[PDB]
Amino acid sequence: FVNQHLCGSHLVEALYLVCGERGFFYTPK
Amino acid sequence: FVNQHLCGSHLVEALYLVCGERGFFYTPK
Amino acid sequence: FVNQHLCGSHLVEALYLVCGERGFFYTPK
Amino acid sequence: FVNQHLCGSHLVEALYLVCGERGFFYTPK
Amino acid sequence: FVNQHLCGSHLVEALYLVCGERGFFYTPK
Amino acid sequence: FVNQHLCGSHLVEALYLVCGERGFFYTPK
Amino acid sequence: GIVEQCCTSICSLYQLENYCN
Amino acid sequence: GIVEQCCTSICSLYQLENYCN
Amino acid sequence: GIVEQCCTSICSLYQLENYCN
Amino acid sequence: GIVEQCCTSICSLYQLENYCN
Amino acid sequence: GIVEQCCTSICSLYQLENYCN
Amino acid sequence: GIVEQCCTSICSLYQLENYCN
Numbered sequence: 001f002v003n004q005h006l007c008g009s010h011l012v013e014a015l016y017l018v019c020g021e022r023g024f025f026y027t028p029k
Numbered sequence: 030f031v032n033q034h035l036c037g038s039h040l041v042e043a044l045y046l047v048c049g050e051r052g053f054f055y056t057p058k
Numbered sequence: 059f060v061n062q063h064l065c066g067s068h069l070v071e072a073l074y075l076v077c078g079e080r081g082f083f084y085t086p087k
Numbered sequence: 088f089v090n091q092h093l094c095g096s097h098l099v100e101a102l103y104l105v106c107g108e109r110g111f112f113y114t115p116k
Numbered sequence: 117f118v119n120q121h122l123c124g125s126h127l128v129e130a131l132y133l134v135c136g137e138r139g140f141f142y143t144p145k
Numbered sequence: 146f147v148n149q150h151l152c153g154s155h156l157v158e159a160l161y162l163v164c165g166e167r168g169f170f171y172t173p174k
Numbered sequence: 175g176i177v178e179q180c181c182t183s184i185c186s187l188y189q190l191e192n193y194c195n
Numbered sequence: 196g197i198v199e200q201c202c203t204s205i206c207s208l209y210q211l212e213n214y215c216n
Numbered sequence: 217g218i219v220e221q222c223c224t225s226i227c228s229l230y231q232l233e234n235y236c237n
Numbered sequence: 238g239i240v241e242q243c244c245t246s247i248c249s250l251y252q253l254e255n256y257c258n
Numbered sequence: 259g260i261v262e263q264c265c266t267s268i269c270s271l272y273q274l275e276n277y278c279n
Numbered sequence: 280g281i282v283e284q285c286c287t288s289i290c291s292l293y294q295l296e297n298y299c300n
């Protein structure tokens with residue numbers, strides 16, 4: 001599905017910003 | 030180095046598009 | 059239409075990444 | 088040069104917003 | 117609401133580009 | 146300096162995610 | 175506001191220029 | 196997961212911080 | 217076109233490669 | 238200003254919070 | 259080219275308009 | 280690491296594939 005994919009593109013960008021030096025693990029549905 | 034930070038913001042969006050359903054881990058340190 | 063325009067913003071970013079040195083032509087509907 | 092690559096990722100998003108329905112061509116080489 | 121938030125992420129990016137040296141004020145709904 | 150311009154495009158997306166409903170002002174000059 | 179106009183219809187570069195300083 | 200929560204409702208900066216390492 | 221295909225279904229990296237020069 | 242502080246040194250999320258209305 | 263003009267000097271929006279079809 | 284390889288030299292799409300789970 002497309003509009004879910006678009007939300008992930010922003011999500012990892014937002015997650016990269018908020019986490020910063022800590023990092024994160026991104027696992028989709 | 031902010032130039033380092035900017036490349037990370039493009040690295041995460043690259044990892045998101047590349048891995049897809051697999052997901053990615055971002056670990057600078 | 060808006061939500062179509064937003065998908066294009068990601069699309070050219072995704073198309074720029076995947077193509078790289080080759081480049082691409084983006085023509086909307 | 089990765090700094091070159093980063094500017095391309097912002098050039099494509101600029102061309103997408105500027106051309107709109109016209110479209111754009113990205114040709115570094 | 118989510119899909120409104122996503123449109124703002126592009127909007128400020130688009131507003132930053134078009135305005136440039138002038139700048140802008142972004143106030144949501 | 147284009148390197149300055151690229152950091153602004155990431156500063157605006159940072160301000161959008163940080164302020165949220167408050168909003169932000171971008172004033173380089 | 176900006177959200178009420180450009181997130182319901184496509185905004186042209188002139189319309190975005192109305193929001194600049 | 197992250198997609199199930201933040202792509203259905205707006206997530207605040209604290210909620211995004213829960214996903215960090 | 218590209219919009220008709222990838223903005224209605226998810227496009228894999230191979231499908232995006234079909235649009236390259 | 239914001240350009241002279243957060244673009245020459247990496248700013249944490251709170252450092253961006255200073256420039257919100 | 260576009261890389262040698264708009265990536266070594268900041269291009270206004272019209273400067274990007276030159277490269278549209 | 281990924282920072283020391285793909286941010287000091289341009290990485291093709293496959294080079295990013297090495298860091299997927």
Ligand SMILES: *C(=O)CCCCCCCCCCCCC
Nearest residue numbers: 001002003004005028029198199
């Ligand atoms: C992957 O298969 C996505 C699974 C999540 C469900 C997608 C649809 C959820 C219901 C909303 C439909 C609204 C769009 C018509």
Ligand SMILES: *C(=O)CCCCCCCCCCCCC
Nearest residue numbers: 030032033057058090282286287
């Ligand atoms: C955490 O600090 C990562 C450790 C390695 C950082 C290397 C940064 C080198 C400085 C940037 C040079 C390249 C600029 C595009």
Ligand SMILES: *C(=O)CCCCCCCCCCCCC
Nearest residue numbers: 059060061062063086087219220
């Ligand atoms: C330009 O005019 C876009 C043409 C494509 C059709 C847009 C609408 C397609 C049907 C989906 C409607 C769902 C949103 C209410």
Ligand SMILES: *C(=O)CCCCCCCCCCCCC
Nearest residue numbers: 088090091115116148261265266
């Ligand atoms: C393909 O390689 C393009 C040919 C011209 C490349 C010029 C790159 C110059 C190095 C970057 C200097 C500016 C850094 C922001």
Ligand SMILES: *C(=O)CCCCCCCCCCCCC
Nearest residue numbers: 117118119120121144145177178
């Ligand atoms: C903040 O509360 C947003 C206020 C704007 C209204 C959001 C819904 C508008 C009607 C469209 C619904 C379509 C999605 C199901």
Ligand SMILES: *C(=O)CCCCCCCCCCCCC
Nearest residue numbers: 032146148149173174240244245
């Ligand atoms: C308007 O021109 C802003 C005034 C201050 C500009 C400072 C730019 C310094 C050159 C960039 C150095 C850092 C590169 C990442």
Ligand SMILES: [Cl-]
Nearest residue numbers: 006064065122
């Ligand atoms: Cl979107």
Ligand SMILES: [Cl-]
Nearest residue numbers: 035093151152
């Ligand atoms: Cl950059």
Ligand SMILES: [Zn+2]
Nearest residue numbers: 006064068122
């Ligand atoms: Zn989007």
Ligand SMILES: [Zn+2]
Nearest residue numbers: 035093151155
């Ligand atoms: Zn950048």
